[PDB]
Amino acid sequence: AALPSIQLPVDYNNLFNEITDFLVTFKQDGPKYMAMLQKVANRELNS
Amino acid sequence: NNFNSITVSLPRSCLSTIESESSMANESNIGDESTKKNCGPDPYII
Amino acid sequence: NNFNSITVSLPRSCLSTIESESSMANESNIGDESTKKNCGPDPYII
């Protein structure tokens, strides 16, 4: 058409699940980021 | 959704200029040394 | 051959219509259902 389409070696739905698993799995050598988030909940972290 | 009249018509001027929407779009609208993009008197195809 | 003024200019309308020259040229000037060939306000490139 006037806007042609192209094919790239990427997939966003595939990597979003990987993002979720990392955020709800990572326990550094309770879970690290999910404790950061629990402090975020109570208004004790801004970044 | 109003077919009773026997009316909508096609736009007479390009709507890209009045919808200065993107920051690079108003930049693509210029160039060609010194002049203003002029699409023409009635440039819409169905 | 007159460079003393400081003038010729580029034509404002397509000269194909006023020079109805060939018998198939005035036929290529028509078509597109019902309308008249309109080249534009100033269409000449150097």
Add this chain to the structure above:
Amino acid sequence: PRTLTAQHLNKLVSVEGIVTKTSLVRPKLIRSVHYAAKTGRFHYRDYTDATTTLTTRIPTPAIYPTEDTEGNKLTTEYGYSTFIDHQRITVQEMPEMAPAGQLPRSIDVILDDDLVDKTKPGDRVNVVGVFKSLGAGGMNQIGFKTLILGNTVYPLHARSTGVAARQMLTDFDIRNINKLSKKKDIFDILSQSLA
């Protein structure tokens, strides 16, 4: 730059002079890629201008796409687009070839991509390229816009200037240079040849 006239337009020329000013290297957008989250598809477009092909073409003024053929909103993928660099420089006649007490003449050179950062202000230079007339000189409504589209840029060395002088060494040259060393009066032979 003084003896270059309107009878040499549209021909390949060599110009001598001094570089007086260089501009900032800027990116130029050629192809832009997008993403639609409602269809999982990527779209692209191409852009061009008059200073990339030596022959005149019919202009194609395409627009920047924000919207899909159905209306879906597109995200812009800056890392997947292609950008090519740009720079402009000005050349002037060298002070020791110019007529004394007379104002100087200058010429504009456009460089792109790989030839973009080869010189600095205050250099002796030789440039080869096409002397091009651009646009319409007011006939749509001073004269035509003239510039050189560079293809070759040579730095040159002169007395009392910031450009160094280097020569290419032949293996034959190296053999004499290395042969001279063993003789144990190198210092005297080289010293007595100094003026």
